[PDB]
Curated annotation (Swiss-Prot):
Membrane topology category: Peripheral membrane protein
Subunit and interaction comment: Interacts with mRNA-capping enzyme nsP1. Interacts (via C-terminus) with host G3BP1; this interaction inhibits the formation of host stress granules on viral mRNAs and the nsp3-G3BP1 complexes bind viral RNAs and probably orchestrate the assembly of viral replication complexes. Interacts (via C-terminus) with host G3BP2; this interaction inhibits the formation of host stress granules on viral mRNAs and the nsp3-G3BP2 complexes bind viral RNAs and probably orchestrate the assembly of viral replication complexes. Interacts (via C-terminus) with host NAP1L1.
Macro domain ranges (all copies): 3-162
Annotated protein name in UniProt: Non-structural protein 3
Span of the entire protein shown here: 1334 to 1493 of 2474
Domain notes: In the N-terminus, the macro domain displays a mono-ADP-ribosylhydrolase activity. The central part called, the alphavirus unique domain (AUD) has a zinc-binding function. The C-terminus region, also called hypervariable domain (HVD), is mainly disordered and binds several host proteins. This intrinsically disordered domain contains 2 SH3 domain-binding sites and 2 FGDF motifs necessary and sufficient for the formation of nsP3/G3BP complexes.
Record: residues binding ADP-D-ribose: D12, N26, G34, G114, V115, Y116
Function: Seems to be essential for minus-strand RNAs and subgenomic 26S mRNAs synthesis. Displays mono-ADP-ribosylhydrolase activity. ADP-ribosylation is a post-translational modification that controls various processes of the host cell and the virus probably needs to revert it for optimal viral replication. Binds proteins of G3BP family and sequesters them into the viral RNA replication complexes thereby inhibiting the formation of host stress granules on viral mRNAs.
């Protein structure tokens, strides 16, 4: 039946229309800047016992609504090699949680492309790991970003696969 899809939206992920949200989290469950700022603004109870290791994800239910805290590596602290593995792992744990949760859709940002980027442009790296994990799930995936140029590039990368 229903065709699982990938979409990109340039808007605040906290305003998503999907059955769940992925927070670009930190490992201590602390409020922060960027995605986590918006997620904390809307779902602060989701931060109750959300602390989890780098490269893992941990879901906290806000009623019927899952907030998947996914912890990408900070590339200021991780080497390129070790960070690539942790980033891959975070997105794989996202896919496992999404499947487990039985959700029909998910709102997701590009992990480790903002305050955890170590100053590097990691759009293509983060998206590649996103695809590698998500591709085997049948949930509709909606990627959120804030930059116009990044929206275009993410959109192209989706479109050219098919
Ligand atoms: N409200 C938002 N909606 C959509 N996209 C956003 C939003 N805020 C930021 N972005 C974009 O989402 C991407 C992820 O950036 P971050 O949220 O900074 O996540 P990350 O790079 O994984 O760093 C996580 C760290 O940031 C802290 O705020 C958080 O507590 C953790 O310490 C970046 O490309 C960023 O430009």
């Amino acid at each position: 039946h229903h065709a699982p899809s990938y979409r990109v939206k340039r808007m605040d992920i906290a305003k998503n229309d999907e059955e769940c949200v992925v927070n670009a989290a930190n490992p201590r469950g602390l409020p922060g800047d960027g995605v986590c700022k918006a997620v904390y603004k809307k779902w602060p109870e989701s931060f109750k016992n959300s602390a989890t290791p780098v490269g893992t994800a941990k879901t906290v239910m806000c009623g019927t609504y899952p907030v998947i805290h996914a912890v990408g590596p900070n590339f200021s602290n991780y080497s390129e090699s070790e960070g690539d593995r942790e980033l891959a792992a975070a997105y794989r744990e996202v896919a496992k949680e999404v499947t487990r949760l039985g959700v029909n859709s998910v709102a997701i940002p590009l992990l480790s492309t903002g305050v955890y980027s170590g100053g590097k442009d990691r759009l293509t790296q983060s998206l590649n790991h996103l695809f590698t994990a998500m591709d085997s799930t049948d949930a509709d995936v909606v990627i959120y970003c804030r930059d116009k140029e990044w929206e275009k590039k993410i959109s192209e990368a989706i479109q050219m696969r098919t």
